[PDB]
C-alpha cells in the first residue's frame, strides 16, 4: 500500500498518513546561506567502539544493518541532543543514476545516496515508544558521492547478493560503522520526521556537511537489489528517496561557521 512507484509513491502517502502534510516533515533542502551557526550546540559525540552489528535485512524498501540496542554499546550524544541515543540500524537511500538518490539536498544539490544511522532516546525504553515522542529519534545523515571506493562499505556491498529480495536477511556480525563516517563531524540540524510511512514527527536530524565517496561499482551493487519478494516480478530497488518537503516554521542550525 506504499512504495516508490508512480502509483504508490510519495505523492500518495498523505491519503493513508495525513501527517505527510505536517509541520515538521523530512527531508528538506538545506539552504547553506540561510542556516545559522548555533553557539548553544555542544560538541557531537559518536561512541561506536562497542557496537554489535547482528544482521542485514532487505525490508522491501531498503536494507537495514541492525545492531544490538539492548545496552549502550553504540551511542550518539551531544550536539543538539539532550541525553543518550542508541544505534538501532543504518540504511541508505539511493538513486537509479548518480545525479539523484539523496533525501536531503544542499542548495538544491542531490547526492547519489544518503546514509542514515538511526538512534533512539534511551529515556523512552524502546524504539517503538521513542517514535511516539517529538525527541524520540536522532538520525545521523551522511551524503554519498561517487568517486573513490569507501573501504569500510565493501563488507556491506558484498553481502547484498544474499539479501536480494524483500524479506531476506543474513547474519552480519562484527561490522564497524565507524568505517562509514567522513573525517569531519560538522553538521546541520533541524527537527523533522521519518521519511517513510508512518512519517512520524519524532526525529532530530543531524546531517553531516562532508560527504563520503563510494565507487561506481559499490553504488551499482545497491541498484541490483529488488523491492519485490522472491518469485514476484523483479523491480529494481532504486530511487527509494522521498523528495524535499516544505521547511515551514523551522530554522536549520549549523555547528560550524
Q: Show binding-site residues for Zn(2+).
A: 91, 93, 116
Answer whether 108's CB lies under 8 Å from 29's CB: yes
Which residues have a Cβ under 8 Å from the Cβ of 82 and sit 6 or more positions away?
A: 135
First CA to last CA distance, the chain: 44
Pull the grid cell for residue 162. 544474499
Q: In angstroms, rounded to a whole number, what is the distance separating the alpha carbons of residues 187 and 125? A: 27
| From 1, 33, 61, 104, the catalytic residue | 61
Query: For Ni ion, which is the closer residue by CB, 71 or 96?
Result: 96
The answer to whether residue 242 forms part of the interface with Ni ion (CB under 5 A) is: no
The answer to whether residue 257 forms part of the interface with Ni ion (CB under 5 A) is: no
Query: For Ni ion, which is the closer residue by CB, 5 or 151?
Result: 5
Q: Show binding-site residues.
A: 91, 93, 116, 195-196
Answer whether 143's CB lies under 8 Å from 111's CB: yes
SS3 call for 142:
strand
The answer to whether residue 1 forms part of the interface with Ni ion (CB under 5 A) is: yes
Answer whether 168's CB lies under 8 Å from 187's CB: no
The 78-107 contact track toward Ni ion, x by CB under 5 A, reads ------------------------------
**Nearest distance from C-beta of residue 30 to Ni ion, angstroms:** 16
Active site residue 12: no
Q: Using CB atoms within 10 Å of the CB of residue 143, give its burial: 0 to 12 exposed, 13 to 18 middle, 19+ buried.
A: buried
Pull the grid cell for residue 41. 550546540
Query: For Ni ion, which is the closer residue by CB, 38 or 198?
Result: 198
Binding region for Ni ion (CB under 5 A) out of 27-35, 114-122, 231-239, 244-252: 114-122
Q: Using CB atoms within 10 Å of the CB of residue 192, give its burial: 0 to 12 exposed, 13 to 18 middle, 19+ buried.
A: buried
The answer to whether residue 116 forms part of the interface with Ni ion (CB under 5 A) is: yes
The answer to whether residue 166 forms part of the interface with Ni ion (CB under 5 A) is: no
Within 10 angstroms of residue 88's Cβ, the number of other Cβ atoms is 19
Binding region for Ni ion (CB under 5 A) out of 70-78, 80-88, 108-116, 223-231: 108-116
Number of residues binding to Ni ion, judged by CB under 5 A = 2
**Nearest distance from C-beta of residue 2 to Ni ion, angstroms:** 5
Query: Which residue, chain included where needed, has cell 540540524?
Result: 189
**Nearest distance from C-beta of residue 257 to Ni ion, angstroms:** 29
Interface with Ni ion (CB under 5 A):
1, 116
Give catalytic residue positions: 61
Amino acid at each position: 500500500h506504499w512504495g516508490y512507484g508512480k502509483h504508490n509513491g510519495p505523492e500518495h502517502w498523505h491519503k493513508d498518513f495525513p501527517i505527510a502534510k505536517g509541520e515538521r516533515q523530512s527531508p528538506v533542502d538545506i539552504d547553506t546561506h540561510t542556516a545559522k551557526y548555533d553557539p548553544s550546540l555542544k560538541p557531537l559525540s559518536v561512541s561506536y567502539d562497542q557496537a554489535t552489528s547482528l544482521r542485514i535485512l532487505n525490508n522491501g524498501h531498503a536494507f537495514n544493518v541492525e545492531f544490538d540496542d539492548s545496552q549502550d554499546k553504540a551511542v550518539l550524544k551531544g550536539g543538539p541532543l539532550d541525553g543518550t541515543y542508541r544505534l538501532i540500524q543504518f540504511h541508505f537511500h539511493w538513486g537509479s543514476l548518480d545525479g539523484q538518490g539523496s533525501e536531503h539536498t544542499v542548495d538544491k544539490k542531490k547526492y547519489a545516496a544518503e546514509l542514515h544511522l538511526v538512534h533512539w532516546n534511551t529515556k523512552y525504553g524502546d524504539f517503538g515508544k521513542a517514535v511516539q515522542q517529538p525527541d524520540g529519534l536522532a538520525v545521523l545523515g551522511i551524503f554519498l558521492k561517487v568517486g573513490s571506493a569507501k573501504p569500510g562499505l565493501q563488507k556491506v556491498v558484498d553481502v547484498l547478493d544474499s539479501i536480494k529480495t524483500k524479506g531476506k536477511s543474513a547474519d552480519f556480525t562484527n561490522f564497524d560503522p565507524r568505517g562509514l563516517l567522513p573525517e569531519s563531524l560538522d553538521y546541520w540540524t533541524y527537527p523533522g520526521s521519518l521519511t517513510t510511512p508512518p512519517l512520524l514527527e519524532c526525529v532530530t536530524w543531524i546531517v553531516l556537511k562532508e560527504p563520503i565517496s563510494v565507487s561506481s561499482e559499490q553504488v551499482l551493487k545497491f541498484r541490483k537489489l529488488n523491492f519485490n519478494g522472491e518469485g514476484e516480478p523483479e523491480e529494481l530497488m532504486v530511487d527509494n528517496w522521498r523528495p524535499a518537503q516544505p521547511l515551514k516554521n523551522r530554522q536549520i542550525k549549523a555547528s560550524f561557521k
